Design a protein around this nucleic acid. Sequence first.
DNA 1: CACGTAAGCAGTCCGCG
DNA 2: GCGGACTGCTTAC
Length: 901
Amino acid sequence: MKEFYLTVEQIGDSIFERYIDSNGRERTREVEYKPSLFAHCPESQATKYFDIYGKPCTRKLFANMRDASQWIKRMEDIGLEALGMDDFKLAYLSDTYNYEIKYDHTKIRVANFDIEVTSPDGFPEPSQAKHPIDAITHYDSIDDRFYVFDLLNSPYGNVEEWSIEIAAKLQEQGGDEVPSEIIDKIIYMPFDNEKELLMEYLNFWQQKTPVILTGWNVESFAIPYVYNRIKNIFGESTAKRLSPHRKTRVKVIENMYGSREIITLFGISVLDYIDLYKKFSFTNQPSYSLDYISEFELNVGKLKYDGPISKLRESNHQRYISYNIIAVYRVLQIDAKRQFINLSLDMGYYAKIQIQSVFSPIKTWDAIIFNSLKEQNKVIPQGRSHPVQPYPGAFVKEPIPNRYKYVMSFDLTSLYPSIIRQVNISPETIAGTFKVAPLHDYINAVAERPSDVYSCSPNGMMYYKDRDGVVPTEITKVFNQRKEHKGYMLAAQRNGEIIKEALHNPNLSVDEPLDVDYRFDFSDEIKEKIKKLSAKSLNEMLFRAQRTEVAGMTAQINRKLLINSLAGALGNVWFRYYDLRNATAITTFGQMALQWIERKVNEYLNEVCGTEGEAFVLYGDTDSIYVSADKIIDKVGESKFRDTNHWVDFLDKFARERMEPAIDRGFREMCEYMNNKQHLMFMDREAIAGPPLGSKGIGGFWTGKKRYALNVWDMEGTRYAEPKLKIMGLETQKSSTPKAVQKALKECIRRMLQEGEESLQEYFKEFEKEFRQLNYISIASVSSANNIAKYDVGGFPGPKCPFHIRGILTYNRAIKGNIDAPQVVEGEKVYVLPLREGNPFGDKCIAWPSGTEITDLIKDDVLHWMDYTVLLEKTFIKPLEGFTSAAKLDYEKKASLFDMF
DNA sequence: CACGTAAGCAGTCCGCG
DNA sequence: GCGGACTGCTTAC
Ligand SMILES: [Ca+2]
Ligand SMILES: [Ca+2]
Ligand SMILES: [Ca+2]
Ligand SMILES: [Ca+2]
C-alpha cells in the first residue's frame, strides 16, 4: 500500500513523524530535515525556480531548520523578501508525500475518551487538578473496545465494582440501559487506588497511542485535567508520556475578552468533538452540553440521575460508571451520523496538513496552494504584515413588506468561487486597473467596456486571460468535489420523499427494508417494491435515506465552506495571499451580477406579460432573486389547474424552459461586457412557493431584508410529499427565541401561509389562553453571556448593563455563599426569564446556565415570580405583530357590523 | 483560536419643548 | 413613546 502520515511535528532541528508504512504498520521516525527557502536572484543567473510573478529565485539549502529560521530574521533585518514555505513541517510533508494521498482510516487510531472527577467544592479546575480522577472510559477505534478505568477507593468514598449485568438491564429493572450493542465491547478494569489507575492508563496509552484524540470538551477539560493530575501526583516527566515524543507545551488561547490554557501534546492530533460540531454542523444551539446535543442529534433521552453530580459516585457508583461509558458512546453515535472525523481526515490529507489544522481555512489553503505551486517549481511569497481595513460585501435588495402569493426563486451556483474562476482572480493574474464608473452604470450596461484585452471586475481590476491563476485552479478542484457530494445529498433527499409518499399506504405484511444505495435516485423496480412494503420497513428505509442525506450534507456543505473561506481569506490580513483588490473584485462583481440579472429578469417578464416598468423581482440577497409568479398563474387562470401539483409543474416548466434560458443569455452578455475568461454565472430555479390550491393561505411574506417565509412545494428539484416552510431570519430561526415560542410562531406562520387569517386568529387565541402552563425552560430566552465582570459593580448592574447580564448578576446574588451551586461560565449561554415587580430577587430578570434546570434552592421562587405577561409580549406578540402587519392581516378578529345578531 | 461582509432586533441611555 | 447612538447578539448570505 501507499504510505501516509499520521502526525508530524517540528522539535528543534528534527521532524518527528508517525506514519503508516507500505505494509500497513504504524511507525515513528525522527528526521533531521534540511529545509529550503528562496531569495530573488539576477535574471542572468540560471534557475528552475521562479516566484508566482515569474521572477527568478535561488534555492537556499540550510544545514538545519534553526538555520533557516535565523536566515528569515536576517532577511527582515536587511529588508529583503525571504520566499518559500516557512512552516517546515508542511515542506517536509510535501517532500515526503509527493502524490495524492490515499489513506486507510482503519489503520488510524482514533480515540474517544471521557473522565469523571468527584468534586465537593464546585467545578474541578483542570489547571489545579486537586481532586482524584475516579473514572476514565477510553474507546479505541482499532480495537473497537471501551476501556473502563474505575477507581473504587477515594478520599470521597469507597465503592463496589460496577456490574455489567445491572448496566445492561432496563431502567425499569433498576438498570442503566447501556446499549446492548456495546455491552460485549466493554473491558472493565477496577482499581483500589488512583496512582495504580493512572500508571496503568499511561501504560495503556503507550500501547495504544491515539493519533486522532476526540471526545466532548476534551481539549478544554479532559486533557488538561489528566495531564495536570498526573503532573501533580508523579511529576512533569510522567505527565509528558501523554505525548509519543514526550513533548508538551502549555498553550494560551486568547480571545477579545480573556484567555484560557490548553495542553499541546506533540505527536497527537486533538479534534475536540464540540469544536468539530461548532465549525461543521451549521447549527447554533441554546446549549452545548453532551446531553443537549445528543438529544438534538439522536433523539435519545436525558441521562437521568438523582441529586448533584458531586454526590453521584457515592450514592450510585453503578450509574456513575454506566453514564461515563454512555457519554463516550454518544459522541461515537453523533460521529456515525455527522461524519466530521471522516471530513477532517479527507480535508487534512487533501491539503497535506496536520489534521487539527482543518479548523483553519487559512492554514488549509496555504498548504493546498503551496503544494500546487511547488509542482511547477514555483516559489510562494513571504507572508507580510497588513493593517486591518474594512471592505464592501454583497448587495441585498430592500423588499416592500407584504404578502407574496406565488413566488419562484433563482440562485447562482457557488457564487464567489464561480466569480474567482470566471474573472480569473488570483495574486499572480493581476494585469492592472481601469477607470471605474459608478456601479449602476455597469448594471444598466451604459458604462464604457472596461477592457478589450483583460478580464474585469467592476471594482477596477483587470486580470490575465492567457492562463488560470493558482487560486482559480485549486478552488475548481474542491468545487468539483463539492458538486459530487451535493448530487448524493439531493438524491437521498428525493428518495426520502418517495418513501414518505409510500408511507401513506403501508402494507399489512412482515418484510425487510430494501438493500439500496440511497445516494442514487431509486429505479422503477425499487419504486414498485417500496409500494408493497410494510410501515416498519418503510420507516427503516426513511431513517437510512435521511442518514445518507446527512452524510452528503456534511461532505458538500463543508467543501462549500472551504471554498467560500478562500474568497473570505483574501480579506484576512494573516493569509499569505491577502489582497483587498482581489477580495473587493469578488464582492463588487457579485453586486453587479445580482443587480444586472434583476434588470434582465424584469425586462424579460415585462416583455412576455406586455407591461412596462413592473417589478417582478421583489427581493434579492447576494446571489439570489425572488420572482413574483402571480401574473404567470393568472395568465392561465387558477381555475384551470387540477390541483396544487399541477401549477407547481407548470411553474417548474416555465422556470426551466423560459426563464433559465433568458437568465443564461443575460449572464453571457455580462461576461462579454466584462471580457471575462469563462462564463460561469449559472443561476438555476431554487424554490416554487404558493398557497395550497383553493385555500385562503397567503403563500409567503417579507418583513424586511433577511426576514421572510415561504410555503415551498419544490426545492432544487425535490418535490415534497408535504409542503415545507422556508423561513429565514424570523424568530422561529433564532436560538435566542424560547423553544415553545419558536414552535408557536412556526404554527402561526404555517396557518398564515397555508390556511389564512381565520385559522391564524383561532390559534393565537388558544396559545394566549394556555401558554402559562408551558414548562419554564421552554419559555425562557437564551443568550451568550460575555463580559459578566465588566458590568458587575459590587454584585449589581453597572452602567449600560445588558439585560441577560443583569439576569446573571441577579442569579449570582441569589446563590451567594454556595460552593455547590452551578456557576455561570463567562462566554457560555444562559436561559433568561423576566421577573414580576416586587420579587424577592430584587431585579427584573434572572439568568442561569443553559441546558440545565435552575438550582432547587431558587427554582420555586423563580417559578412563582416568572413574568408570563412580559415573556409573551416580548417573545411572541411583538414578533407576531411584525409578521402580520407585514402580511396585511390581523391575529385578532376586528369588530364588524355582523356583531351581533 | 480557526474565512469574509450585510443586516436584523433587544436593550440602554437620553433627547424631544 | 419612539428614534438615534451605541453595545450585544444573532442570523443570511
Ligand atoms: Ca460526566
Ligand atoms: Ca448560491
Ligand atoms: Ca403500499
Ligand atoms: Ca443564496
